[PDB]
Every structure is written in C-alpha cells, then in structure tokens.
C-alpha cells in the first residue's frame, strides 16, 4: 500500500512539463495514434478519419528528410522574427502547449521552408551521385 511499485510514465505524462522533459518520451504519444448496421458506420467513419490524419502527418514527415526517425536536425536557421525567445529558457522554462500558441502564426512558413530545404538538399545529393 506504500506505493513503491515501478509505475512507468503513462500516456501524456509530461504534457505540462518542459520540453527537455517532454522530449524524453515522445514515443508514448506516437504509438497510441493508430491502435489506441448504422452503429457500424460510426465505427467505419471513425476509422477512416483516423487513418488519413495519421497518414497526413506521416507524409509531412515523409516528405521532409525524416522518414521515420522521429527526431531529426535540419539545415534551416531559426529566424528570430519567429520566436524571439532566448535559447536557455525554451528548453526548461515554457511548455509545449505554450509553444503551439507561441508559434502558430509562424507555422506554414516553416512548413513551406521544409520542402524546399529538403528538395534542394535532395537534388544536391543527386548532383553528387550523378558525377560518380
């Protein structure tokens, strides 16, 4: 009853925590995204809404340089017009839900930046591979 049993950090465990502690376990939010005659079409139209919005983030991940690696550096620099925050804070001061509000204007500039920064790097691998 003393509660000493190991209790692994469950789903959404660091959801209020900082980024340096939320990025410790990212797989737990990843893996509960696919698994977990008219009330069968409410099962059907929940399943076929789940697999497109799973495939859409797996495609936006796929069309960058990050096939299934789930954490990846890139080459674009961080323009301070986007966030203007210090680096030493934004890994232990703020939180991720505060980040999605803190960045949501500046999204679709980054998402537009990622395809061209990947396909330019892509053709540069092709120009490297073509000469040899």
């Amino acid at each position: 009853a003393v509660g000493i049993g190991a209790v692994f950090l469950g789903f959404l465990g660091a959801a209020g925590s900082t980024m340096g502690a939320a990025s410790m376990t990212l797989t737990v939010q990843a893996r509960n995204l696919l698994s977990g005659t008219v009330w069968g079409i409410k099962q059907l139209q929940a399943r076929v809404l789940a697999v497109e919005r799973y495939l859409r983030d797996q495609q936006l991940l796929g069309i960058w340089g990050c096939s299934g690696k789930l954490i990846c550096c890139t080459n674009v620099p961080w323009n301070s017009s986007w966030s203007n925050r210090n680096l030493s804070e934004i890994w232990d001061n703020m939180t991720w839900l505060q980040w999605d509000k803190e960045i949501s204007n500046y999204t679709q500039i980054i998402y537009g930046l990622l395809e061209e920064s990947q396909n330019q790097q892509e053709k540069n691998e092709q120009d490297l591979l073509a000469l040899d």
Partner: antibody
C-alpha cells in the same frame, strides 16, 4: 538480468559519515523505486531507506529509527544509487544490501538484492 | 509500526520434506507480504511476492499463501540449495519492516 553491486563499506567511528553506492544494470533504472536494507550481525533485516522512482513520485522514505539521520538519493542518468550516512551509531553496523523493487501494483516488494557492502561502526 | 514475527526461528528438516513457514503481522497488510531466501555466505533472493505470486527464475517448489496478518511460505520438496535464512516483508505502511527470519538447516 538485474545486477546490483554495492561499494563504499568500511569501519567508521560513531558520529561519522559514509556514502554507500549501488551500481545497477539490467533494468530501466529511473522507473523503479530502490531501497537500502541492512542485515545485522544477528542476521536480522532492517529496512534502511527507499527512494521512489521517477514515475513513483521520487520521494524518500526512512523508518523512524533513522529518519532525520539517513539520506537516500539516486543519479538515474548513471544508474547509481547512494546512501548518505551521518551521525552514525554502533547499531548501524550491518551488511547493507541494495535492492530493486518490482513493477506496477504488485511491485513494492524487493525483487532483486545486491551483494552487499559491510559497515562496521565501533 | 507493523511488526513481522517469523516462526519458527530455526527448523531442521531432511532434504526432500516440505515445510510451511509462518510470518505474522501486527496489522492487516491485505496481501503485502513477500518471502526471500538468503543462503549462507550469500545475499537474499526473492522467492515469493505479495503473499503468493511466483518469481521468474525461482523453482516451483516455492509456494506462498496467506491473507491479512498471517502468511505462509511452503517449500514442497526442500533441496540442499534451499537451506538458509528466510525473510518476510510488508508494504502496507511505513516503515517497511521484516520478520526475524527462519533458519532452515540440513
């Protein structure tokens, strides 16, 4: 498998201080609550300290005979457990074992014990 | 505090026989009682968890039973390697406490 290897035992005068160590392997160290239990020369087992795991709350627990005197801590990144002793007494003389608990609801038991390091206070 | 009383303190049995070791708690611990074997010159080894739950790697001859305050560890054909010091342990309340041990001799 689970391996627990303690070090730091020695002969200490009463009132002195001593840090024991337990180097663990074979499991996800931070998730488990870990304890020090000592075995007296009469072979009696007396629980000495517990520090909860990262998903257990990470608090420390001590019995009344040592509370305010003994401090258990862990450094999860290197998978090492520590037992910091101050105001030592001759009654503390024992073999000290590091022990790992189980998982979930059925895991507050000691699941694995180390080899032990000997403390003699006289 | 929960006091754990192990009985008997010492018991001599011939290898091949079966034994029942008692551990009695000063308060109810619903099922929070575990058993350990410590052989001579060795560290303790977990035998039985939460009154009755078996442990991977421990032989099937170790069995546990009991509920509340009274718990029993059965060893149903004792082997030479089973002789040693036997401990019960409670997790119902702080502080964690042990029984005094049963010494099994050959």
């Amino acid at each position: 498998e689970v391996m627990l290897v303690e070090s730091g035992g020695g002969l200490v005068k009463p009132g002195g201080s001593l840090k024991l160590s337990c180097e663990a392997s074979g499991f996800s160290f931070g998730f488990y609550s870990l304890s020090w239990v000592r075995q007296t020369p009469e072979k009696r087992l007396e629980w000495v300290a517990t520090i909860a795991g990262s998903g257990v709350g990470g608090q420390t627990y001590y019995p009344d005979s040592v509370k305010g005197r003994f401090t258990i801590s862990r450094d999860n990144a290197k998978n090492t457990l520590y037992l910091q002793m101050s105001s030592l007494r001759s009654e503390d003389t024992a073999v000290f074992y590091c022990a790992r608990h189980g998982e979930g609801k059925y895991g507050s038991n000691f699941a694995y014990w180390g080899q032990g390091t000997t403390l003699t206070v006289s | 505090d929960v006091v754990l009383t192990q009985s008997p303190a010492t018991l001599s049995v011939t290898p091949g026989d079966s034994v029942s070791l008692s551990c009695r708690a000063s308060q109810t611990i619903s099922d929070n009682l575990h058993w350990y074997l410590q052989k001579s010159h060795e560290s303790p080894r977990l035998l039985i968890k939460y009154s009755s739950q078996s442990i991977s790697g421990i032989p099937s001859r170790f069995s546990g039973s009991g509920s509340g305050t009274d718990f029993t560890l059965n060893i149903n054909s004792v082997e030479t390697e089973d002789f040693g010091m036997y401990f019960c342990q409670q997790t119902n309340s702080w502080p964690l406490t042990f029984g005094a041990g049963t010494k099994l001799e050959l």
